[PDB]
Amino acid sequence: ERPTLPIPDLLTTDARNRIQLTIGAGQSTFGGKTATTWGYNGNLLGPAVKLQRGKAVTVDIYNQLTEETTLHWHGLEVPGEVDGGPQGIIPPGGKRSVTLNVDQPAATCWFHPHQHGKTGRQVAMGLAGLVVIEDDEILKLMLPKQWGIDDVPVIVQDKKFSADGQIDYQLDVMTAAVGWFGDTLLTNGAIYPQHAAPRGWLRLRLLNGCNARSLNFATSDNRPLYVIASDGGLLPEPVKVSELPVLMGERFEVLVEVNDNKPFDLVTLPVSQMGMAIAPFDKPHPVMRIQPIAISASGALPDTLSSLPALPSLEGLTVRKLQLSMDPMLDMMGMQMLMEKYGDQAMAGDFHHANKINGQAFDMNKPMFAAAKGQYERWVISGVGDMMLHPFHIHGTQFRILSENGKPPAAHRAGWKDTVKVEGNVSEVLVKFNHDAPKEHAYMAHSHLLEHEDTGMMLGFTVLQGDH
């Protein structure tokens, strides 16, 4: 009796070379209770916008909410002016158009709001969509590619609800400290759905769309997952894993084997992050049921996928230090609240500017620095002196991780990424920005634990000129 997995529509340009996105409020049902929800072209979540490398598209965005919002293309390398950070306000009842000139490798990216101080609430209410970038190279690989049959997006999110059935979002001292988390897991908006998949190989495009919760994917019968792509695109070869940790905002594409008369579940395993192994997440928790079917499939697991360029020489590059911090009093009170409500299981395994980078809370009208254009830079990001998890994301770039929180990156994490783990230690990434970003439409760099972002842990930076 499980509902079928909802499939976002795959949306391409029309004869005018446009795509229309409407942002609005509607209603959804969760376990027989109605909730007010927000969506793109719909009442919850959104479509998957399909783009080709080297082709321009124009996106018309209609805000039919009664409050301001913005639309950011997470993972897509575009100029500040169309990046849709906090300065890209779309008035309630208004329309903004952006032209996107796609110039990066095939990848699964996504889109969501970036309204200043309110991003967590707007994502919790339901706003998220997907971007599918294709190029010439990926289409020659004979990967599974029937959308909604053997090539399927999997957007995983937690929410909590009040007794009246509404989504229960509060930015308070506990949530500003540890993040907004809940007791109900959704998969493309549904609770424990089933997906009917052809015998052979199934391609899952995994997105952790949670506000604050880290995930760790595995299968019910321990069959392996073959990682084929990260945030910014294909890896050089598939990497076989028994489990796959995924931070907030991260994407991975995996292939899994589907065999006759053997259903299995995709699950998430308990994580060690504060607050996130509370019941029902103290044990392995189901995400979706895979049901084998006997319709045609042509997809395969290739020996080779692509080629990564060599990491450049590190001598001579500009180094930028980014020190993350949390107000000791916020940490104090939030942790105490968490302990009092839930006890030891919560540790298993004015705060509106309390969270900072280099001693400064986000200033929308003062960028912290100007980065070079077209030149490699080394950015060193530290959570030393703090216990919380900071998945650190940088707009405008796909980067390479040199060191991740005390160690070289795992093989499946060594390709193109837009997020890096920072948690009580220091990480180092190699970045290059191909496009301009002025003071009036600056690039953001921030923790993707959304409650931290909303209470100050973000900076603006410009990109202007390069070598002179």
Residues near Cu ion, by CB under 5 A = 74, 86, 116, 249, 326, 329, 331-333, 335, 339, 347, 364, 386, 388, 395, 435, 444
Instruction: Say if strands 355-357 and 251-258 run parallel, antiparallel, or are unpaired.
Output: unpaired
Task: Kindly compute the dihedral angle of the four CA atoms of residues 323, 328, 329, 330, in this order, to the nearest 10 degrees.
Answer: 50
Distance, in Å, from the CA atom of 279 to the CA atom of 144, rounded to the nearest integer, reads 36
Of 311 and 339, CB closest to Cu ion: 339
Spatial neighbors of 343 by CB under 8 A, at least 6 apart, are none
Distance, in Å, from the CA atom of 72 to the CA atom of 83, rounded to the nearest integer, reads 6
Distance, in Å, from the CA atom of 338 to the CA atom of 178, rounded to the nearest integer, reads 8
Secondary element (H or E) of residue 173: helix 173-178
Spatial neighbors of 328 by CB under 8 A, at least 6 apart, are none
Of 152 and 444, CB closest to Cu ion: 444
Q: From the CB of 150, what's the least distance to Cu ion, in Å?
A: 27
Of 73 and 264, CB closest to Cu ion: 73
Q: From the CB of 111, what's the least distance to Cu ion, in Å?
A: 8
Of 35 and 278, CB closest to Cu ion: 278
Spatial neighbors of 388 by CB under 8 A, at least 6 apart, are 177, 178, 274, 326, 331, 423, 449, 452
Q: From the CB of 32, what's the least distance to Cu ion, in Å?
A: 32
Of 14 and 440, CB closest to Cu ion: 440
Contact 83, 114 (CB under 8 A): no
Of 46 and 86, CB closest to Cu ion: 86
Q: From the CB of 324, what's the least distance to Cu ion, in Å?
A: 9
Q: From the CB of 240, what's the least distance to Cu ion, in Å?
A: 28
Q: From the CB of 468, what's the least distance to Cu ion, in Å?
A: 18
Instruction: Say if strands 194-198 and 285-293 run parallel, antiparallel, or are unpaired.
Output: parallel
Q: From the CB of 116, what's the least distance to Cu ion, in Å?
A: 3
Q: From the CB of 73, what's the least distance to Cu ion, in Å?
A: 7
Q: From the CB of 452, what's the least distance to Cu ion, in Å?
A: 9
Of 30 and 392, CB closest to Cu ion: 392
Distance, in Å, from the CA atom of 438 to the CA atom of 429, rounded to the nearest integer, reads 23
Distance, in Å, from the CA atom of 398 to the CA atom of 433, rounded to the nearest integer, reads 9
Contact 154, 190 (CB under 8 A): no
Contact 167, 120 (CB under 8 A): no
Of 74 and 400, CB closest to Cu ion: 74
Secondary element (H or E) of residue 373: none
Of 274 and 301, CB closest to Cu ion: 274
